[PDB]
Amino acid sequence: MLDTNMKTQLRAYLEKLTKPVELIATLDDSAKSAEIKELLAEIAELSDKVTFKEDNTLPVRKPSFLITNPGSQQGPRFAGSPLGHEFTSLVLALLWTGGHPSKEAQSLLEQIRDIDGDFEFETYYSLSCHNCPDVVQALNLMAVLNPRIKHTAIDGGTFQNEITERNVMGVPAVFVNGKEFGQGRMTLTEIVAKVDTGAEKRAAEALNKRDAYDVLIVGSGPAGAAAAVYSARKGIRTGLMGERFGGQVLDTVDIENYISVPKTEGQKLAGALKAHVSDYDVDVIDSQSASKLVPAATEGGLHQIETASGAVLKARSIIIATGAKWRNMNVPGEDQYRTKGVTYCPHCDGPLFKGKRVAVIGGGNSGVEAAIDLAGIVEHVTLLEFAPEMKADQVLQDKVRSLKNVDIILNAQTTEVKGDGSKVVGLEYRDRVSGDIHSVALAGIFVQIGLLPNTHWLEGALERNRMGEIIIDAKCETSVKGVFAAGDCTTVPYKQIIIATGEGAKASLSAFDYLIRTKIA
Amino acid sequence: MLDTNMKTQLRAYLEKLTKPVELIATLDDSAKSAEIKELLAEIAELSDKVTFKEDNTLPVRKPSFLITNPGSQQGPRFAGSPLGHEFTSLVLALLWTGGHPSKEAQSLLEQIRDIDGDFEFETYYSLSCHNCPDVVQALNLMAVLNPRIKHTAIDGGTFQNEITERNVMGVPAVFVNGKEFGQGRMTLTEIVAKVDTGAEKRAAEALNKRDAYDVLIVGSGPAGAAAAVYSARKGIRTGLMGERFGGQVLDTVDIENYISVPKTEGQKLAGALKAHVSDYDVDVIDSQSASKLVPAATEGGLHQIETASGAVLKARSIIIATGAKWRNMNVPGEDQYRTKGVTYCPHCDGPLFKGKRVAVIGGGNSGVEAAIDLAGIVEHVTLLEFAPEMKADQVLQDKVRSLKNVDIILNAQTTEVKGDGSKVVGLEYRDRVSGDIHSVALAGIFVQIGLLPNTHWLEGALERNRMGEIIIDAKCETSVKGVFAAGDCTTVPYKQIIIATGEGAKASLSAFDYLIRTKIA
Ligand SMILES: Cc1cc2nc3c(=O)[nH]c(=O)nc-3n(C[C@H](O)[C@H](O)[C@H](O)COP(=O)(O)OP(=O)(O)OC[C@H]3O[C@@H](n4cnc5c(N)ncnc54)[C@H](O)[C@@H]3O)c2cc1C
Ligand SMILES: Cc1cc2nc3c(=O)[nH]c(=O)nc-3n(C[C@H](O)[C@H](O)[C@H](O)COP(=O)(O)OP(=O)(O)OC[C@H]3O[C@@H](n4cnc5c(N)ncnc54)[C@H](O)[C@@H]3O)c2cc1C
Ligand SMILES: [Cl-]
Ligand SMILES: [Cl-]
């Protein structure tokens, strides 16, 4: 059943709905059906914009419910329990249906809304499974975005019978129009690339007719832009493809460590990178997502990059510069206070809180070192570690535990970020041991949870470490000849703009060397 | 005896004398004395500003000659033959005496002119020795700069007797005021550091009383400036010492690959780096040369940096960022056409010569790849390799030998760069096999001979590769705990401004990590 903290979190999330949401259930006399009925009734009382209706006559699984807006039959459907690890999947399905935007690439969202064709997806999950959430969330978002795409996420614990009849060997297990589609972790980009394989739009057909490149750079944040300038300066045929030019820089509000520029803005630096790239002959391709790398069958041959849009670009050398997603706490309040107290930048804004109190989320070496540094300039620091013991090396723990102005909370998970509409003013978190919720007043929150390199699409194609970073050497060479990598998606120790531009340059020079050594004279 | 090409080169060099030079010989009846007499008479006929006088009554070795200006007794003295590998040492002694400036650090020159005290140096060399030239040249420059410093460079082939009486075991062998001073390769900085050890000036005594730093950065070109910004942003006590702020950037005229800046000037970028560093609390120390690194005796202890001026700075961590000297052809015309056709930049100015002819000096992988690239955009390329066979990998040779617009000259050494007062117009070089001199008309010369990392002062203290580059890993860690390195003085594969600033940042973050792990709480 929903426990007290899930109800508290859900209420906070739902205050944000801008459009009404209706939960339509189809139930039978089973015990599980009674749990679902009680669950939906409990969710509906948390918000004025959410209502519960039941129609036991519909030709759908029992129990199951549709998440939609009044007056429509559009939306994802959950068959069985949507709690456990799918709680966040349920929260997102409610918020997106209620008008909340997705954080996915805008070009990807647009391609999903334009998908032609009918696709009925079904995904089997288990409440304890850790990789099902991403898959369920990706397909639910597609169903919210395009009425021609249906999705029913099925709880394997409730429809145990189906899992044996259909040979499901592991979760998450996805079927589309009756046939196996995929198993295991999958990103929205990879799902879209696999399903929208028909006559591609104008953009795709055009890309398919481009001549092969001497170097194609994938991703256009600072590392890729830097590579593009260096390559074009050598006069070779250069392609730079990416989702949106500028990478993380574009949305950054204040930057004070891009060497030689005391202070600039994300939009202006991104614009300057664009102007530097436009000073040369570079084919800049925007609004495209690379979905697959197919290595050259021979030395001096061509590598291929497939895109989500269905096109295939080809080149003599490749530079991967897709960056990384920066992990969130995923709690109510976080998005709203995104530029008003919640800080994700790895090495900035500390002097901003001199004389104030802050928190650091994460107890690994970076988290503990971030606390030690902040302790030197802020009035106070609260550090929250999810595990029962800090993960940092011993020597760091010993030093952080000797600082009077720092408090270490173990076995804790943030449950909410509080504000007054203008700035952050506190956070609430939960003691994993006892379930109790505690509050703490503060002006800043430094999230230092981790990074998620945008490299899943390269799985099995280039060697990566356990965290997903592409392994490179000093020359930015990968495990595949002619393929290089630069920036935050690689094993480079620190993630900064000036570091990424320097890596992009190195990768471009290595690719140039590789080209002269292998290109036919 | 002087051969025809040495006479040709010397005549070209001496056209540049601005002040008259007098060669004063003291000779005996020996055969070697007759050679010296003929040599000096031959040099004096090559220039209106050079005269030969002999005074066999002076209390100096026979044969020997003083290189000075009329009316003075100041200058270096050569005892025996000044030819063979000392030819360039003789050329420099003539030019400096004739008013030509040294390319050494200005602060170093100033310290030499201010040396108090009398020092009579003697250096034994052999005509075939390869490391004697630098030592002889360093001491000769000191004697030209300060009358209280005398130097007599002695040809061991002529004074064979002395070499056995004084136990000389190898050359170069230096004595000062009668006592052994040093043996082996030595730089001017290291010689000055060892001889000027008295009551240091005001600057030094002041430096000695500075508190220990949390990080001291040695060298203030782009890598060191970047490190300084990153360190100060962490709020630690940061010192940045260097000879002259800006490093190679300061004298660069046009820069078009500093990412995000389509085009700027060396003076302006250097100024911007200075402004970024001044936005924080960094103790910037100029006009100082590090001469020795003394590693901390214990973890968490202090490393020491000794300076040529006699001071000792100390710090918990050190970042070495001293860059590299870029090798020259060392021929008449080169200096004068420094910014007018002769290009040393590793990856710039190629499109500048579209439709024109150029040369590339150097046949290693960089030289051959530079030729292949230029061949794509210039009308013609002549590549000169000193050795009898290109050193580049086979695959590169095969490709460069298939390009019709490129000519490869093996067994060659440039002897002169020609111009019309405004721009380069050609070069002459010599065929090592036959001695013949050839000319070639052209508008550009790309020198790609090699780099000389400014790391000799670190010999034996940090591990370096055969070329003198400090070995580092991805985190910029060296072979000594708490000492990091960044930029052109390290093993980083490519030497560029944007690459160096990114490395400086990495090194600063690694030093910060090291500091939190070892500094007492
Ligand atoms: C909120 C915030 C503030 C920050 N502030 C600073 C700061 O002040 N100073 C600083 O130095 N650093 C800062 N950083 C870190 C800095 O932004 C990164 O280190 C830098 O942007 C990394 O550059 P990059 O080129 O490697 O990758 P990114 O900038 O991530 O760019 C990669 C690009 O590739 C795109 N892409 C991803 N996958 C694909 C695919 N499959 N196909 C095609 N394109 C794809 C991405 O969408 C993106 O546009 C900040 C980071 C954050 C999150
Ligand atoms: C003529 C020319 C043009 C160039 N043009 C470009 C270009 O357009 N774009 C580009 O990207 N790159 C260019 N480069 C290369 C670029 O300048 C270098 O890669 C860059 O300056 C390296 O920075 P650095 O900080 O490592 O070292 P450097 O700039 O060399 O600076 C090291 C500093 O340390 C000082 N120092 C040395 N020894 C000591 C000591 N013992 N104690 C104290 N201080 C010391 C040096 O004198 C110097 O000031 C050019 C190079 C040359 C020679
Ligand atoms: Cl940052
Ligand atoms: Cl360059």
Side-chain angles (χ1 to χ4, degrees):
Chain A
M1 317 288 289
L2 274 191
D3 62 35
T4 303
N5 182 238
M6 313 170 61
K7 285 177 59 164
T8 301
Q9 277 202 38
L10 206 34
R11 182 187 285 104
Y13 275 128
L14 301 172
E15 301 172 333
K16 256 54 180 172
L17 291 173
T18 64
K19 314 165 54 170
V21 175
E22 179 168 11
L23 309 176
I24 305 182
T26 299
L27 309 165
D28 60 33
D29 67 358
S30 72
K32 196 62 207 171
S33 274
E35 295 191 39
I36 296 309
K37 176 169 188 156
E38 185 58 32
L39 166 68
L40 299 174
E42 286 174 15
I43 288 167
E45 51 180 38
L46 303 179
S47 175
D48 170 49
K49 301 305 258 302
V50 179
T51 62
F52 171 34
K53 288 309 179 69
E54 81 175 71
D55 189 337
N56 304 328
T57 218
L58 308 183
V60 299
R61 292 173 175 79
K62 299 181 186 183
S64 64
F65 66 95
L66 174 57
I67 296 169
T68 183
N69 303 112
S72 56
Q73 302 298 294
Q74 189 183 336
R77 168 180 296 283
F78 282 88
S81 183
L83 302 188
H85 281 87
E86 293 309 323
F87 177 67
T88 304
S89 298
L90 173 62
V91 165
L92 285 169
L94 298 168
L95 297 178
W96 297 323
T97 295
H100 190 281
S102 169
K103 291 165 180 52
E104 295 283 345
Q106 176 64 214
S107 50
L108 187 63
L109 294 182
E110 290 183 349
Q111 180 189 349
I112 292 165
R113 291 184 200 103
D114 295 329
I115 284 172
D116 261 305
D118 308 304
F119 299 93
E120 219 157 310
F121 287 93
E122 298 183 297
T123 300
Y124 293 84
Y125 64 91
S126 84
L127 290 304
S128 56
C129 182
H130 288 25
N131 337 125
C132 294
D134 285 346
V135 175
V136 169
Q137 288 162 26
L139 299 163
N140 282 350
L141 176 54
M142 285 168 80
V144 170
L145 291 176
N146 186 328
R148 302 271 284 310
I149 306 167
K150 311 296 187 48
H151 177 227
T152 296
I154 310 164
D155 168 17
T158 301
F159 291 81
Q160 307 178 316
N161 62 309
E162 272 179 55
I163 276 196
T164 60
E165 161 188 62
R166 287 225 257 181
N167 293 129
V168 166
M169 294 184 252
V171 284
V174 188
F175 289 76
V176 67
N177 297 333
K179 305 293 194 172
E180 309 200 349
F181 181 79
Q183 302 76 6
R185 188 197 154 192
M186 311 180 82
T187 68
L188 174 68
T189 297
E190 281 151 20
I191 291 169
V192 175
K194 285 172 58 60
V195 81
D196 195 6
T197 300
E200 316 141 51
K201 291 182 149 227
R202 54 82 188 176
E205 190 186 337
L207 289 172
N208 274 340
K209 45 193 57 170
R210 299 241 170 114
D211 284 348
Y213 290 93
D214 285 315
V215 64
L216 169 65
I217 300 156
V218 185
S220 56
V229 170
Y230 267 73
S231 289
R233 278 171 62 74
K234 289 293 176 193
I236 60 175
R237 179 167 155 69
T238 309
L240 172 61
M241 63 155 4
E243 291 170 346
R244 197 180 66 182
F245 196 95
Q248 296 286 349
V249 173
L250 193 61
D251 297 349
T252 301
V253 44
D254 177 55
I255 305 177
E256 293 179 280
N257 54 9
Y258 189 77
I259 305 299
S260 83
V261 182
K263 195 177 190 167
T264 180
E265 300 61 49
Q267 301 220 305
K268 201 175 162 188
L269 181 52
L273 290 171
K274 179 57 159 283
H276 206 168
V277 166
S278 306
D279 198 29
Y280 300 101
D281 191 25
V282 174
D283 188 335
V284 179
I285 299 165
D286 247 291
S287 303
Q288 292 299 330
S289 294
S291 55
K292 188 172 201 302
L293 161 68
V294 184
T298 183
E299 182 178 299
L302 299 171
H303 294 296
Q304 300 172 74
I305 290 288
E306 297 185 349
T307 69
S309 70
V312 177
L313 296 170
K314 52 271 188 184
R316 293 174 212 263
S317 64
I318 297 289
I319 294 177
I320 302 302
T322 49
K325 271 180 187 64
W326 296 61
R327 299 177 65 195
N328 307 282
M329 294 175 281
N330 299 307
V331 301
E334 182 178 34
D335 282 343
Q336 171 177 22
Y337 289 104
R338 191 152 286 276
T339 58
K340 305 169 185 199
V342 188
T343 314
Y344 298 86
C345 78
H347 305 286
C348 95
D349 272 320
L352 191 51
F353 306 79
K354 65 165 193 184
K356 305 176 183 190
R357 336 186 70 205
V358 306
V360 169
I361 308 302
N365 292 323
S366 52
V368 176
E369 261 180 9
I372 293 167
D373 195 49
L374 290 168
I377 82 285
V378 302
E379 169 190 298
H380 190 92
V381 181
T382 291
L383 179 158
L384 294 174
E385 162 67 88
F386 181 77
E389 303 272 290
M390 272 182 290
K391 177 181 185 182
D393 300 341
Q394 266 297 303
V395 50
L396 292 179
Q397 300 184 41
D398 291 349
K399 177 174 288 189
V400 70
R401 283 186 189 301
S402 76
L403 305 170
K404 301 99 67 190
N405 67 333
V406 184
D407 296 313
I408 162 188
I409 306 178
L410 294 177
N411 265 311
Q413 192 182 323
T414 302
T415 53
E416 191 165 341
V417 168
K418 302 232 144 177
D420 59 21
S422 184
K423 67 170 83 68
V424 169
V425 293
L427 68 64
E428 299 177 355
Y429 66 84
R430 158 186 77 90
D431 174 43
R432 295 219 296 155
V433 169
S434 82
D436 296 358
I437 308 290
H438 301 279
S439 58
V440 23
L442 67 243
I445 304 176
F446 289 79
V447 181
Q448 300 262 327
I449 301 170
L451 214 56
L452 306 168
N454 289 314
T455 60
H456 186 263
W457 67 281
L458 287 164
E459 196 187 22
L462 294 187
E463 317 266 13
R464 301 181 297 153
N465 64 20
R466 187 84 79 292
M467 296 167 36
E469 293 169 330
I470 292 166
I471 289 159
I472 55 155
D473 65 14
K475 264 182 189 201
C476 288
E477 305 182 297
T478 65
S479 61
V480 174
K481 297 190 303 177
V483 176
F484 308 84
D488 291 4
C489 66
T490 75
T491 43
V492 71
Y494 307 112
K495 314 300 182 185
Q496 293 286 273
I497 300 159
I498 195 69
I499 293 176
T501 58
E503 291 290 303
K506 282 195 300 210
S508 170
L509 291 172
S510 291
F512 179 68
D513 166 66
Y514 182 79
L515 186 69
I516 301 309
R517 288 170 182 272
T518 59
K519 186 169 172 168
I520 283 162
Chain B
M1 317 288 289
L2 274 191
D3 62 35
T4 303
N5 182 238
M6 313 170 61
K7 285 177 59 164
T8 301
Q9 277 202 38
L10 206 34
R11 182 187 285 104
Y13 275 128
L14 301 172
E15 301 172 333
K16 256 54 180 172
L17 291 173
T18 64
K19 314 165 54 170
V21 175
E22 179 168 11
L23 309 176
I24 305 182
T26 299
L27 309 165
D28 60 33
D29 67 358
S30 72
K32 196 62 207 171
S33 274
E35 295 191 39
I36 296 309
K37 176 169 188 156
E38 185 58 32
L39 166 68
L40 299 174
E42 286 174 15
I43 288 167
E45 51 180 38
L46 303 179
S47 175
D48 170 49
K49 301 305 258 302
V50 179
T51 62
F52 171 34
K53 288 309 179 69
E54 81 175 71
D55 189 337
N56 304 328
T57 218
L58 308 183
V60 299
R61 292 173 175 79
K62 299 181 186 183
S64 64
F65 66 95
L66 174 57
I67 296 169
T68 183
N69 303 112
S72 56
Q73 302 298 294
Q74 189 183 336
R77 168 180 296 283
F78 282 88
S81 183
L83 302 188
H85 281 87
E86 293 309 323
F87 177 67
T88 304
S89 298
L90 173 62
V91 165
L92 285 169
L94 298 168
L95 297 178
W96 297 323
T97 295
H100 190 281
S102 169
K103 291 165 180 52
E104 295 283 345
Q106 176 64 214
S107 50
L108 187 63
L109 294 182
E110 290 183 349
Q111 180 189 349
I112 292 165
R113 291 184 200 103
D114 295 329
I115 284 172
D116 261 305
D118 308 304
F119 299 93
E120 219 157 310
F121 287 93
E122 298 183 297
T123 300
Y124 293 84
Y125 64 91
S126 84
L127 290 304
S128 56
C129 182
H130 288 25
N131 337 125
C132 294
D134 285 346
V135 175
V136 169
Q137 288 162 26
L139 299 163
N140 282 350
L141 176 54
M142 285 168 80
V144 170
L145 291 176
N146 186 328
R148 302 271 284 310
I149 306 167
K150 311 296 187 48
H151 177 227
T152 296
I154 310 164
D155 168 17
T158 301
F159 291 81
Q160 307 178 316
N161 62 309
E162 272 179 55
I163 276 196
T164 60
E165 161 188 62
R166 287 225 257 181
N167 293 129
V168 166
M169 294 184 252
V171 284
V174 188
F175 289 76
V176 67
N177 297 333
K179 305 293 194 172
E180 309 200 349
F181 181 79
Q183 302 76 6
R185 188 197 154 192
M186 311 180 82
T187 68
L188 174 68
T189 297
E190 281 151 20
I191 291 169
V192 175
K194 285 172 58 60
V195 81
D196 195 6
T197 300
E200 316 141 51
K201 291 182 149 227
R202 54 82 188 176
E205 190 186 337
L207 289 172
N208 274 340
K209 45 193 57 170
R210 299 241 170 114
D211 284 348
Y213 290 93
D214 285 315
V215 64
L216 169 65
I217 300 156
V218 185
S220 56
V229 170
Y230 267 73
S231 289
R233 278 171 62 74
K234 289 293 176 193
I236 60 175
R237 179 167 155 69
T238 309
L240 172 61
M241 63 155 4
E243 291 170 346
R244 197 180 66 182
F245 196 95
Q248 296 286 349
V249 173
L250 193 61
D251 297 349
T252 301
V253 44
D254 177 55
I255 305 177
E256 293 179 280
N257 54 9
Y258 189 77
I259 305 299
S260 83
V261 182
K263 195 177 190 167
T264 180
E265 300 61 49
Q267 301 220 305
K268 201 175 162 188
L269 181 52
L273 290 171
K274 179 57 159 283
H276 206 168
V277 166
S278 306
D279 198 29
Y280 300 101
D281 191 25
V282 174
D283 188 335
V284 179
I285 299 165
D286 247 291
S287 303
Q288 292 299 330
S289 294
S291 55
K292 188 172 201 302
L293 161 68
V294 184
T298 183
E299 182 178 299
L302 299 171
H303 294 296
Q304 300 172 74
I305 290 288
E306 297 185 349
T307 69
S309 70
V312 177
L313 296 170
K314 52 271 188 184
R316 293 174 212 263
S317 64
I318 297 289
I319 294 177
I320 302 302
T322 49
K325 271 180 187 64
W326 296 61
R327 299 177 65 195
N328 307 282
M329 294 175 281
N330 299 307
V331 301
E334 182 178 34
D335 282 343
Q336 171 177 22
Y337 289 104
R338 191 152 286 276
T339 58
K340 305 169 185 199
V342 188
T343 314
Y344 298 86
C345 78
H347 305 286
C348 95
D349 272 320
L352 191 51
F353 306 79
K354 65 165 193 184
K356 305 176 183 190
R357 336 186 70 205
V358 306
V360 169
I361 308 302
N365 292 323
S366 52
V368 176
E369 261 180 9
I372 293 167
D373 195 49
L374 290 168
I377 82 285
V378 302
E379 169 190 298
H380 190 92
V381 181
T382 291
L383 179 158
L384 294 174
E385 162 67 88
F386 181 77
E389 303 272 290
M390 272 182 290
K391 177 181 185 182
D393 300 341
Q394 266 297 303
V395 50
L396 292 179
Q397 300 184 41
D398 291 349
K399 177 174 288 189
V400 70
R401 283 186 189 301
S402 76
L403 305 170
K404 301 99 67 190
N405 67 333
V406 184
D407 296 313
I408 162 188
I409 306 178
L410 294 177
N411 265 311
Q413 192 182 323
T414 302
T415 53
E416 191 165 341
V417 168
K418 302 232 144 177
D420 59 21
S422 184
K423 67 170 83 68
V424 169
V425 293
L427 68 64
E428 299 177 355
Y429 66 84
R430 158 186 77 90
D431 174 43
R432 295 219 296 155
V433 169
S434 82
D436 296 358
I437 308 290
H438 301 279
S439 58
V440 23
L442 67 243
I445 304 176
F446 289 79
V447 181
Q448 300 262 327
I449 301 170
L451 214 56
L452 306 168
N454 289 314
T455 60
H456 186 263
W457 67 281
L458 287 164
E459 196 187 22
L462 294 187
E463 317 266 13
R464 301 181 297 153
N465 64 20
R466 187 84 79 292
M467 296 167 36
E469 293 169 330
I470 292 166
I471 289 159
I472 55 155
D473 65 14
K475 264 182 189 201
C476 288
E477 305 182 297
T478 65
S479 61
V480 174
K481 297 190 303 177
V483 176
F484 308 84
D488 291 4
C489 66
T490 75
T491 43
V492 71
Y494 307 112
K495 314 300 182 185
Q496 293 286 273
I497 300 159
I498 195 69
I499 293 176
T501 58
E503 291 290 303
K506 282 195 300 210
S508 170
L509 291 172
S510 291
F512 179 68
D513 166 66
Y514 182 79
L515 186 69
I516 301 309
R517 288 170 182 272
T518 59
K519 186 169 172 168
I520 283 162

Tab-separated table of all heavy atoms in Angstrom, chain A residues 279-293:
chain	number	residue	atom	x	y	z
A	279	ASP	N	33.604	30.140	-38.474
A	279	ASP	CA	34.682	30.857	-39.147
A	279	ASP	C	35.371	29.884	-40.127
A	279	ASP	O	36.261	30.259	-40.890
A	279	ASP	CB	35.693	31.362	-38.105
A	279	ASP	CG	36.615	32.480	-38.643
A	279	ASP	OD1	36.191	33.247	-39.541
A	279	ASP	OD2	37.760	32.611	-38.147
A	280	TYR	N	34.953	28.621	-40.108
A	280	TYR	CA	35.569	27.615	-40.974
A	280	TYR	C	34.524	26.795	-41.755
A	280	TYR	O	33.308	26.922	-41.545
A	280	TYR	CB	36.422	26.665	-40.133
A	280	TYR	CG	37.543	27.399	-39.403
A	280	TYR	CD1	37.411	27.710	-38.044
A	280	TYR	CD2	38.701	27.767	-40.095
A	280	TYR	CE1	38.425	28.413	-37.386
A	280	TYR	CE2	39.711	28.478	-39.440
A	280	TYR	CZ	39.572	28.805	-38.087
A	280	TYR	OH	40.545	29.516	-37.459
A	281	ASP	N	34.983	25.915	-42.624
A	281	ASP	CA	34.011	25.158	-43.404
A	281	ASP	C	33.628	23.867	-42.677
A	281	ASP	O	34.228	22.814	-42.883
A	281	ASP	CB	34.564	24.853	-44.798
A	281	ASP	CG	33.490	24.304	-45.738
A	281	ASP	OD1	32.295	24.594	-45.502
A	281	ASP	OD2	33.833	23.600	-46.716
A	282	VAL	N	32.667	23.977	-41.776
A	282	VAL	CA	32.240	22.803	-41.029
A	282	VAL	C	30.760	22.624	-41.331
A	282	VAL	O	29.999	23.581	-41.259
A	282	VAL	CB	32.349	23.002	-39.509
A	282	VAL	CG1	31.736	21.756	-38.789
A	282	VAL	CG2	33.809	23.234	-39.101
A	283	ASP	N	30.380	21.394	-41.657
A	283	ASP	CA	28.981	21.050	-41.913
A	283	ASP	C	28.353	20.829	-40.509
A	283	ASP	O	28.541	19.787	-39.866
A	283	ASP	CB	29.035	19.776	-42.719
A	283	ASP	CG	27.701	19.342	-43.257
A	283	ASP	OD1	26.617	19.686	-42.685
A	283	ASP	OD2	27.766	18.629	-44.285
A	284	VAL	N	27.649	21.802	-39.985
A	284	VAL	CA	27.059	21.632	-38.650
A	284	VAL	C	25.632	21.029	-38.764
A	284	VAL	O	24.757	21.599	-39.424
A	284	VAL	CB	27.029	22.994	-37.911
A	284	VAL	CG1	26.382	22.834	-36.524
A	284	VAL	CG2	28.481	23.569	-37.819
A	285	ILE	N	25.406	19.870	-38.137
A	285	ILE	CA	24.108	19.188	-38.220
A	285	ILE	C	23.481	19.222	-36.839
A	285	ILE	O	24.056	18.736	-35.858
A	285	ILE	CB	24.329	17.750	-38.713
A	285	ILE	CG1	24.954	17.804	-40.090
A	285	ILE	CG2	23.058	16.992	-38.762
A	285	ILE	CD1	25.552	16.490	-40.543
A	286	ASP	N	22.318	19.850	-36.735
A	286	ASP	CA	21.670	19.957	-35.445
A	286	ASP	C	20.426	19.087	-35.385
A	286	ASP	O	19.967	18.544	-36.404
A	286	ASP	CB	21.262	21.415	-35.180
A	286	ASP	CG	22.037	22.039	-34.040
A	286	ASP	OD1	21.819	21.621	-32.873
A	286	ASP	OD2	22.865	22.947	-34.311
A	287	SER	N	19.910	18.925	-34.172
A	287	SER	CA	18.688	18.169	-33.967
A	287	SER	C	18.775	16.724	-34.387
A	287	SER	O	17.794	16.159	-34.839
A	287	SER	CB	17.529	18.865	-34.707
A	287	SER	OG	17.411	20.205	-34.250
A	288	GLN	N	19.955	16.115	-34.252
A	288	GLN	CA	20.076	14.704	-34.579
A	288	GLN	C	20.683	13.981	-33.377
A	288	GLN	O	21.545	14.545	-32.716
A	288	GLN	CB	20.967	14.516	-35.813
A	288	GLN	CG	20.373	15.051	-37.120
A	288	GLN	CD	19.075	14.353	-37.485
A	288	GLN	OE1	18.882	13.174	-37.157
A	288	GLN	NE2	18.185	15.066	-38.185
A	289	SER	N	20.276	12.736	-33.119
A	289	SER	CA	20.836	11.929	-32.002
A	289	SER	C	21.506	10.679	-32.589
A	289	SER	O	20.870	9.939	-33.329
A	289	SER	CB	19.725	11.471	-31.056
A	289	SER	OG	19.121	12.575	-30.377
A	290	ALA	N	22.782	10.434	-32.270
A	290	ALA	CA	23.455	9.251	-32.782
A	290	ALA	C	22.878	8.089	-31.989
A	290	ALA	O	22.755	8.178	-30.761
A	290	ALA	CB	24.980	9.343	-32.556
A	291	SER	N	22.517	6.996	-32.670
A	291	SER	CA	21.964	5.859	-31.959
A	291	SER	C	22.803	4.588	-32.085
A	291	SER	O	22.588	3.620	-31.360
A	291	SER	CB	20.532	5.562	-32.462
A	291	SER	OG	20.573	5.393	-33.874
A	292	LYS	N	23.741	4.562	-33.008
A	292	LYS	CA	24.566	3.369	-33.174
A	292	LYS	C	25.896	3.667	-33.885
A	292	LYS	O	25.929	4.481	-34.817
A	292	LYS	CB	23.826	2.330	-34.040
A	292	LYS	CG	24.537	0.983	-34.105
A	292	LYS	CD	23.638	-0.040	-34.803
A	292	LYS	CE	24.015	-1.455	-34.473
A	292	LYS	NZ	25.419	-1.752	-34.842
A	293	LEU	N	26.987	3.027	-33.450
A	293	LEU	CA	28.256	3.211	-34.168
A	293	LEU	C	28.564	1.874	-34.793
A	293	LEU	O	28.577	0.868	-34.087
A	293	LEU	CB	29.415	3.591	-33.214
A	293	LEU	CG	30.827	3.385	-33.742
A	293	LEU	CD1	31.105	4.355	-34.872
A	293	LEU	CD2	31.846	3.701	-32.574
